[PDB]
Design a protein around this ligand. Structure first.
Ligand SMILES: [K+]
Ligand SMILES: [K+]
Ligand SMILES: [K+]
Ligand SMILES: [K+]
Ligand SMILES: [K+]
Ligand SMILES: [K+]
Ligand code: NA
Ligand code: NA
Ligand code: NA
Ligand code: NA
Ligand code: NA
Ligand code: NA
Lengths: 174, 174, 174, 174, 174, 174
């Protein structure tokens, strides 16, 4: 299932995201297991906080933290866990956590998939309230898990996101 | 996953349907990808209209439009996206669209799976309001997608549905 | 998908459960098909009663009734159908039904997965109201399916559950 | 609020029902308090069983058990708790419980309110599965509440329902 | 309840809306009855189409069609039926229907109530996709109700909305 | 509606709570308006965080902050907004905020209303994870509202809660 999904049709700008956690879903963290082909319950979020947007990853990538590149996907309705969406980048949230330096990409679907998000051209177009909610979420969601912490550094743009994707694809292939 | 699901236990009357879109689900069109083994987000429905009944397809079939035979499955509660249900035909909705002549089968589960639908013996037994809602849905759901259109021609019965299934199974096998 | 999920990381006490039916889900019984890699609609529950806790099975097991060992998993929020959760046993509900002697294990997730259930150390710690609801459910849910019946015998503890798991793993391997 | 809602526009055949418990709602029994003008939590259903159809009462009535006449209202989608629906009778379920002889009317909305239920002309038109689910519900829902019990006697028709309504209206007015 | 809610704190620009139908709610049309103080089920929408945004009215107003001024309220999450929200106008949708000339105001909450909508300053700021969905909804939702019809004429701005409100308040007071 | 609900049947230990915000509801803060008899949208929570348990107030009370005594009510399923529940105290969360010293009572329903919570005899019986989630919620939910802040001081017991209730009832009556 998940192991054979291509990273993208035209990398780094046209990529695929496998959704693990739908926007506003009950506060349970799922992770795709490529060895099993199934979603695995990773943990119940200690704070009970919910992801404000859909969350997943780009298959066939390997980031600096040893996991695939993570992506937040903004949509008008939450997406199905375990589904795949063709996406494009808006920017990224830069942070550091227990696993090391971490970044989360921010994306929306391909314009033909989601005409509703077509006017979001970069992270600057995302409403301030939603960016603030995403930052707050990452700063606070691990507050009740011992030995885990998150410091948010700031936002970066589409170019930074593309570098993350290209690096991830290359790292995966050895 | 989806690629190895048989078309049916006793074709054309006893067939399997892989569900893509649950009844009354939020207006997001998913499509099963047999190359990936996963549901893919095809598009956000422009009108925001929801499928009034469950929607999916019969695996190992190839219809005249180049896709597997499509099926609407009537149930008392919506079915899980990506699940498989053993079904029987009631009839079909005949239409034409941008891909060419299209028909949608109407089905219910096997009587042992869903005793609640056992007294629905043909499309004539389906309540008029629900048939009207299904027709309205197909006539209007693509109203905000440029270059797409649908003209509904009428309803046909179980014999027509069985022909669609037998043709689809044969076309698939070459 | 389901066919290659290990029975557990450290059997019988540290095992995996594939979820078929989320707690409080609409009253539709799904079963994982290892030949298809998908959930199949088994039946609409005649009484319309819902599982009061999540329900699934341990893969790579074969119980006395010819199916894998069944497990009820208690969680603060319902789990996704088709997901896998790392679990530990609290005890089991002993019963007899049309397939013969049947037992249902009662489990919670691994403490690192679900800190919320960490203080549930055995079936005696589960609230009386919930145990009573589970017993009532199994006694009554098949009341409107001809030729099916269930007599609940009583609860047993963690040792009994571990025997069921070890027996199931051995039976599966021949 | 509830105290001034008329029993009906043309009694006993054209009556109003104040909804207390929506179909398939979480298993919490609400009761309208005419002294407060609000819904009050009466009890959490011990068995966790849900009302299979909407449940409420006809205001300005007093039945033999000291409460207003109770009504089950069948609809395609659940109704809002505390809302009022114009309804017509299909029949009634006769039973006895701890409060004494009790009957529950079965109704659908006025045909102009709900065209979907217009072809339900009496209790004989209601699907057997749904009647069986309603009977099962009343026989079992109080199974875990000490000192409470229910014996279902059978179904009766529209004439019996009209007698219940006329008697209730008269009893209320002294 | 509803009869004593003021039309607004500072009319016509700062007004109150009583919500009848939450955004994306199941397709049941409720109407507030000021004589009863309760929501009444008006009808099940024949097409099964859902309001794409919250819908209600300004109390203590009387429009040209004999009902209070109607308002669509855009929010990030649907609002409770029967709740009251402090709102401001963005514009209005002009149409004609069976009751005569009708207009629907478009509004968002007061900026202190909903900071998320604060950057919506007029109807021109509302995304095109959402305006198109609202127009489509009103053009099509009555398609299966005999003798009812709707022709959409176009959008107008904040000044037109304010005129509707001032006229409505004056008409109500005699 | 709300203005005539008694503070309790036997104060301070047997009191009534009017629910404003159901557990896990979408992050919209409603407040009961006794002048209107309706729930009013107070604000959309800036952080998007949800109340982890039901939230409301005791009518006919006036606390030190100028509002009625606030109460968190723990239940197995969320309660309806605007409903009334007969409750008993477990303790209280002591804090300070922009309005001054504030305390939130913690309660469960009367044992006959909710047998499921009958073994919760004080705040010490509430699971640690849930107490931690409640504390986290109050510390963080106002993080994105300018000029608002919350410092949590600690938990207190049933005696402290009873003092809050008795003081509130007395303050209300002049
Ligand atoms: K490229
Ligand atoms: K055949
Ligand atoms: K072991
Ligand atoms: K009459
Ligand atoms: K003014
Ligand atoms: K007392
Ligand atoms: Na990561
Ligand atoms: Na097709
Ligand atoms: Na079994
Ligand atoms: Na009664
Ligand atoms: Na109007
Ligand atoms: Na307060």
């Amino acid at each position: 299932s998940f192991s054979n999904v291509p990273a993208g049709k035209d990398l780094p700008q046209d990529f695929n995201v496998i959704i693990e956690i739908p926007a506003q879903s009950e506060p349970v963290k799922y992770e795709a297991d490529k060895a099993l082909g199934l979603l695995v319950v990773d943990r119940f979020i200690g704070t009970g906080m919910r992801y404000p947007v859909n969350y997943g990853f780009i298959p066939q990538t390997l980031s600096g933290d040893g996991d695939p590149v993570d992506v937040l996907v903004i949509t008008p309705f939450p997406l199905l866990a375990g589904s795949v969406v063709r996406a494009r980048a808006l920017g990224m949230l830069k942070m550091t956590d227990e696993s090391g330096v971490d970044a989360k990409l921010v994306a929306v679907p391909h314009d033909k998939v989601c005409p509703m998000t077509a006017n979001l051209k970069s992270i600057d177009d995302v409403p301030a309230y939603l960016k603030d909610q995403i930052k707050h979420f990452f700063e606070q969601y691990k507050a009740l898990e011992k030995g885990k912490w998150v410091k948010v550094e700031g936002w970066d743009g589409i170019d930074a996101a593309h570098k993350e994707i290209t690096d991830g694809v290359a790292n995966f292939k050895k």
